[PDB]
Each structure stands twice: as structure tokens, then as C-alpha cells.
Amino acid sequence: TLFCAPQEMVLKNVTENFNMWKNDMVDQMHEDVISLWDQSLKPCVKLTGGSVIKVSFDPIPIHYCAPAGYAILKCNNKTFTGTGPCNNVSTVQCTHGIKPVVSTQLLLNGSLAEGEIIIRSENITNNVKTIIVHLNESVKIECTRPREAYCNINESKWNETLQRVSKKLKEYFPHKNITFQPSSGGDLEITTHSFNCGGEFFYCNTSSLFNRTYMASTRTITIHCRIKQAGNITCISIITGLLLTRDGGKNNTETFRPGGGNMKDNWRSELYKYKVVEV
């Protein structure tokens, strides 16, 4: 176990291996957020028998700390891909604050890349594995209500973001055209950009956002959402990354689609720089 709730020390001349897809911490966070989700049950007190009885789901930066006998190592290389040996590594008592945001397609309120846009993956050949993209410059998205709702994005900032992401994806597939298409199918949770905002689940259609084909100012995009749990409701989130899934490689093109659904991908995007070891 790893206890969930400020000191750090660098380890001079130490090299320890990290594996993005084999991380006991990502397994831990997945179980802990599942446990907190399951608390949509009535609390209980006791007088004679089991007598059955704050909707503040709003995320707060939580931390994962090392219990006695265990330590947490952190990779200080800010371009670290997730898998392989890290040269610059330190012992930290607790991980940085992590807002446990459960969104699909777009990663909201996370940490930005240090430098350029980063594909957080040693290799993206495996089509089954989700591609975690980390953006260096954030993109605002205002979602509002008066059932149904809508979201707005700057447009010139969005189609610019996808252009810089397509150039950086083309580094992995040189001499290949990079295309984006909407989600190919499945449940509404994954086919749309879904997320929780003050007791409300949104399901925003992203077909207009992901329909670009890249060869080798005050305008906005408005996307419609379905709502399922005040008259007016609003969220002003910040897109910090994307979750993509690659189709089967065709002739001279590579198609990417917004992915999600696996809640472990959301925790991989933040915990890719940590590892639990024994003291």
C-alpha cells in the first residue's frame, strides 16, 4: 500500500528504470479513485440497527506518500518519455498534487510539458496502447448550461495545437501524412469528450474538433453536450493534454482518434515520473 494525503533529495550518480505501463502507483490511484467513486451510497450510524442517512466532488490536489519501509523515486528529466533508465533521479516523500479529474479525449487541469509538445511514450507502434500527448501551451474550454449544454474553444488556438501535435507525431512516423478523425465507436463515455463538473456529467461531441488531414482571432468552435447528474452551470477547464489511439497504419497515412475510457491512462499522464521501491 501507498498512503494518500514537503522534502526531496537528489541521488548523485544513480540510475533506476521506470516502466510507464508497469507502475504500482498508477494501479494504486486507479483503486483509490474507484473507491471514492463508489461513495454514491447513503452513510450509516448505529443506535439499535443499521440506520441509513456534501456534493463537493470538485477535485483537490492529492498526494501519494511513502509509508515506513518504502521510498518514492522521481525522474527529474523533464523530457522523460515514461519507459527506460532515468539518469537524474531523487527520493521524494510525497508526489506533487494531482487533481483526480476523470475525462476522456481531452486531459483537463493537468501539468504542461516543459519545452515543446511531448508524446509521452518511448514508442507508439502498439496500436492498443493509448498515446498520451502533453501540451506546453494550454487551451481554454468554457462549458455552460442555461438535458443539454455547450462548450467553446478559441479555434485559431485549437487548429494550431493540432498542427503542432501532427508535426510532433510525424517525427515517430517519418514520411507519413498525419490525419485526425472522430472516435470510431463504442459507448458514449468514450465516443465524446466526457467529464464531471459540479454534480453534472457532460458528453460533448468532438466530431468537428477531430477531422483534420495534414499532407506531407476572436472566432470559436461550439460543441454540443448531453447532460446527466441551479439553472445556470459553468466550468472553465484548461486542456493540458490529449489521449489518442492510432488506427491500422494505411499506405502513406496514419489516422489518430480521441481515446479514453481506461481510467489508468489519466493517472499514467501524471504518475509516469514516479516509482515505489523498498528503502
Epitope: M20, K22, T83, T125, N126, K129, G186, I190, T245, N262
Partner: antibody, heavy 121, light 114 residues
Framework: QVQLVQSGAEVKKPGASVKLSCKAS????????INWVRQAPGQGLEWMGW????????GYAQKFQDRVTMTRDTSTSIAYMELGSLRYEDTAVYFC??????????????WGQGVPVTVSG | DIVMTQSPLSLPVTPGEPAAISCRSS????????????LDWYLQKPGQSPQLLIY???NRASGVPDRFSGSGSDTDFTLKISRVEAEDVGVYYC?????????FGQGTKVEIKR
Amino acid sequence: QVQLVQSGAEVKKPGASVKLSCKASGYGFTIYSINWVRQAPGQGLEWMGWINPRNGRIGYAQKFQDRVTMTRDTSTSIAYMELGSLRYEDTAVYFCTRGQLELTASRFDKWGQGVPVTVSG
Amino acid sequence: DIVMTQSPLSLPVTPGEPAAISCRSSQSLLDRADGNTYLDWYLQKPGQSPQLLIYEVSNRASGVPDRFSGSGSDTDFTLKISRVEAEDVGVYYCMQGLEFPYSFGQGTKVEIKR
């Protein structure tokens, strides 16, 4: 205990569609994938695509991309695969198989008994 | 497509003696983001559906007898049988599970030498 039962045998005319079933039982249906693999008579094996029965995510083989639809019904642990615009070259036995999720959809550890699908006039 | 090349296509074996089948892929099957090598060995006995023998190069599937064994690295793989029993007759296909489409070898017909 772990079984993958399939729907007998079908005969369809050229241009038509088929919807094959694959009833899973004896294990956690949503914690394992369902892949479909076909076999022409006397020929080898050909993978068609996968599905994540938990959320419905799919990934098809490029040659079947715009003519196949894989879906599931978690209320009955049944997995479907619909192949449209049938050509005579689709006459083959169609198997469904249990695979992995997250790291890969491979490691076909359990298999259905197959369904012959003749395509002819 | 990652073409999978099996050698040999035919293999008659006197029962009790050992057998080996090679599989060679046009690309590496090591998932560098994971550390795992996605290669499986399937057996299709006559008039039956296929079945898993080995997964990820060397791991035996449940029930598979210790006679069967896998080995190899990166691009060359070998399924080995120590004692070729009567039940082992069938077509053996290697298979990569790394990139779409998942591709199989052409098959190896193992039969009794007479």
C-alpha cells in the same frame, strides 16, 4: 468452466451482411477482449479486429476497416461482429477468441468453435 | 504489415523424438514502451479450432505440457517439443501481437514420420 459459444452456420448471397454472435461465460467478460479471426477452406489464419467489452472500444484490420462493425451486449455477455458487402472471398470459418486489454489485445487463450459462412449465389 | 515467416512448412516427426519450428518477423516484436515481446504460438489440431500453446515468446499457457517450450529474442523465435506425442499432430502458427493487423505465420504441418 470458461466457454465461448457460437451461432451454428450461415449462408449469405454476395453484397449481403452477416452478424455473428459469441456468448462468453465462466469469467469476467469486461476484463478481457474479444477478437475475431477467420479461416478460408484449406487456408491459414487472418485477424479481423478487437473490442474492449467494458467500454466498447474497437480496432479493425485495415482490409476490413470500412465494412465491419464489432459491438457487444454486456447485459448478456454476447459479442457481435457484422461483416457487410460480402464477396465470395469472405467464404470462411469465423472464430471469436478471448484476448487481453490495455497492453495488448493478443494472447488468444480461449476460442469459440467457429461458424462457417458460405457466400454464394 | 509485419510479415511472419515460418520454417519449415512441412515436418514429419518419428514419435518420441524432438521437434523445432522457427518463426522470423520482418520487424522487431519488442514493445519498447513496455519491455514485453508480443509473440504467441498457436496449435490447430485436425477438425478443431486453434488453441494457445505459448504466449510472449516463452510462457506456457495453462494446461500446456512441459514438452512444449518457447525461446527467442527480438526477430527470431523457436517452438520446441521434446517428445512428439500422437496428440501433437496439427498446424502450428506463430503470431505477432504488437502492431495492427495482427499477423500469423503460414503454418507448419507436423505429422507422424512413417
